[PDB]
Design an enzyme around this catalytic site. Structure first.
Site, PDB file in Angstrom:
ATOM      1  N   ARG A   1       0.854  -1.184   0.000  1.00  0.00           N
ATOM      2  CA  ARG A   1       0.000   0.000   0.000  1.00  0.00           C
ATOM      3  C   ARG A   1       0.890   1.234   0.000  1.00  0.00           C
ATOM      4  O   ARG A   1       1.867   1.286   0.757  1.00  0.00           O
ATOM      5  CB  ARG A   1      -0.907   0.069   1.246  1.00  0.00           C
ATOM      6  CG  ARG A   1      -1.866  -1.101   1.494  1.00  0.00           C
ATOM      7  CD  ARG A   1      -2.808  -1.334   0.324  1.00  0.00           C
ATOM      8  NE  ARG A   1      -3.624  -0.156   0.055  1.00  0.00           N
ATOM      9  CZ  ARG A   1      -4.293   0.062  -1.067  1.00  0.00           C
ATOM     10  NH1 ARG A   1      -4.345  -0.847  -2.029  1.00  0.00           N
ATOM     11  NH2 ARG A   1      -4.896   1.237  -1.243  1.00  0.00           N
TER      12      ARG A   1
ATOM     13  N   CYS B   1       2.464  -1.627  -9.753  1.00  0.00           N
ATOM     14  CA  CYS B   1       2.297  -0.829 -10.954  1.00  0.00           C
ATOM     15  C   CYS B   1       1.404   0.373 -10.670  1.00  0.00           C
ATOM     16  O   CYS B   1       0.364   0.254 -10.015  1.00  0.00           O
ATOM     17  CB  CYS B   1       1.691  -1.683 -12.068  1.00  0.00           C
ATOM     18  SG  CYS B   1       1.413  -0.770 -13.600  1.00  0.00           S
TER      19      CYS B   1
ATOM     20  N   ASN C   1     -13.840  -5.056  -9.143  1.00  0.00           N
ATOM     21  CA  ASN C   1     -12.399  -5.163  -8.970  1.00  0.00           C
ATOM     22  C   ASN C   1     -11.987  -6.609  -8.697  1.00  0.00           C
ATOM     23  O   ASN C   1     -11.218  -7.219  -9.460  1.00  0.00           O
ATOM     24  CB  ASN C   1     -12.031  -4.212  -7.823  1.00  0.00           C
ATOM     25  CG  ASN C   1     -10.538  -4.092  -7.575  1.00  0.00           C
ATOM     26  OD1 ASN C   1      -9.779  -5.021  -7.816  1.00  0.00           O
ATOM     27  ND2 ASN C   1     -10.126  -2.955  -7.014  1.00  0.00           N
TER      28      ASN C   1
ATOM     29  N   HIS D   1      -6.591  -2.830 -10.537  1.00  0.00           N
ATOM     30  CA  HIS D   1      -5.440  -3.135 -11.395  1.00  0.00           C
ATOM     31  C   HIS D   1      -5.822  -4.116 -12.490  1.00  0.00           C
ATOM     32  O   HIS D   1      -5.953  -5.321 -12.231  1.00  0.00           O
ATOM     33  CB  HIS D   1      -4.308  -3.743 -10.582  1.00  0.00           C
ATOM     34  CG  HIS D   1      -3.406  -2.737  -9.971  1.00  0.00           C
ATOM     35  ND1 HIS D   1      -3.654  -2.184  -8.735  1.00  0.00           N
ATOM     36  CD2 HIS D   1      -2.252  -2.191 -10.411  1.00  0.00           C
ATOM     37  CE1 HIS D   1      -2.680  -1.342  -8.437  1.00  0.00           C
ATOM     38  NE2 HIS D   1      -1.821  -1.323  -9.439  1.00  0.00           N
TER      39      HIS D   1
HETATM   40 MG   LIG Z   1      -7.874  -5.928  -8.497  1.00  0.00          MG
HETATM   41 ZN   LIG Z   2       0.663  -2.596 -14.764  1.00  0.00          ZN
END
Ligand SMILES: [Mg+2]
Ligand SMILES: [Zn+2]
Ligand SMILES: [Mg+2]
Ligand SMILES: [Zn+2]
Ligand SMILES: [Zn+2]
Ligand SMILES: [Zn+2]
Lengths: 162, 162
Positions: free
Chosen positions: A60, A104, A118, A97
DNA sequence: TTGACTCTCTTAAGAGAGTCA
DNA sequence: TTGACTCTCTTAAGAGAGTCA
């Protein structure tokens, strides 16, 4: 901070800093037996991380700026979406993500959606295997597959029907 | 320690009791635009729940039996699997609702698998829509679909490539 | 031995905020 | 002002254990 101009300036400063993070090429399953390549912009493993960034947990981070002489702070992946609604259907919006790579910070690998949406991408068959996400997945989810179920449905007697 | 015979007796008393729970007919999506029917054996909303059963959380229950003066207690959906391994690939096994109906205790609607496998069924296209679970889903997951993403991947400048 | 309550914990996708230098 | 740490919290799929009569 409060003004649109101030928020745009935060997004622009964040992009400039993340844009200097190391670019790591990741070869990924797309579904359908096809492979693609993603370019992740990865925050460093240890301090220093970049101007404005600090680690608040194992995976985090937060972005911090001083504006009207006061500190404003955001989750490090939330900054691209500061001008977006922060909820949908009464559910909190989260940075999600598409590359399944927490370090990233490439905004081309992020979307802004409910925590359920998500999470669900972890099991998506991927953009070449049947993804139906309206904002399309970049890869097959890492947990897609047959699973490893230990025991299936069963009864000892005759009390139940499916 | 409880013998195999004693564990079998626990499973049998559990089945006897759950078999008297109200049986509710539900019409459900199977994937591929097909509809099907599941028959859930639903624990009551409030006490009394049935012999041996007690509520430890809003949608959590436990089954309790006293054997040779010792009180034994199990999560209410774990009882069908007491003769199975409790872990796989280093992960704890969990009771997983194929019908996605938490109050249901029909053992024909349960399987025994890692928490990740369990969660992933929420997004499965279903047994007539492309399910690849080795222990097949009974229905399309309730969260399957295009999602409700508020904002997709985007950048303001030109610092990033996908 | 039993029922009906009470409490906190696990996981892995995500968060906010305080203490120092 | 900026950096580098510290802490606990949220969610929705799941858990274990105590008290009292
Ligand atoms: Mg995710
Ligand atoms: Zn990435
Ligand atoms: Mg489940
Ligand atoms: Zn997808
Ligand atoms: Zn059911
Ligand atoms: Zn499935």
């Amino acid at each position: 901070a409060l003004t649109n101009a101030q928020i745009l300036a935060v997004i622009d400063s964040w992009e400039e800093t993340v844009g200097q993070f190391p670019v790591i090429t990741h070869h990924v399953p797309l579904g359908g037996g096809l492979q693609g390549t993603l370019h992740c912009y990865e925050i460093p493993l240890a301090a220093p991380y970049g101007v404005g960034f600090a680690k608040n947990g194992p995976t985090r981070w937060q972005y911090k700026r001083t504006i009207n002489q006061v500190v404003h702070r955001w989750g490090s992946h939330t900054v691209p979406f500061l001008l977006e609604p922060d909820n949908i259907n009464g559910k909190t919006c989260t940075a999600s993500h598409l590359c399944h790579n927490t370090r990233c910070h490439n905004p081309l690998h992020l979307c802004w959606e409910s925590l359920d949406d998500n999470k669900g991408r972890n099991w998506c068959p991927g953009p070449n295997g049947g993804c139906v996400h309206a904002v399309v997945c970049l890869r097959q989810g890492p947990l897609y597959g047959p699973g490893a179920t230990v025991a299936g449905p069963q009864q000892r007697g005759s009390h139940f029907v499916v």
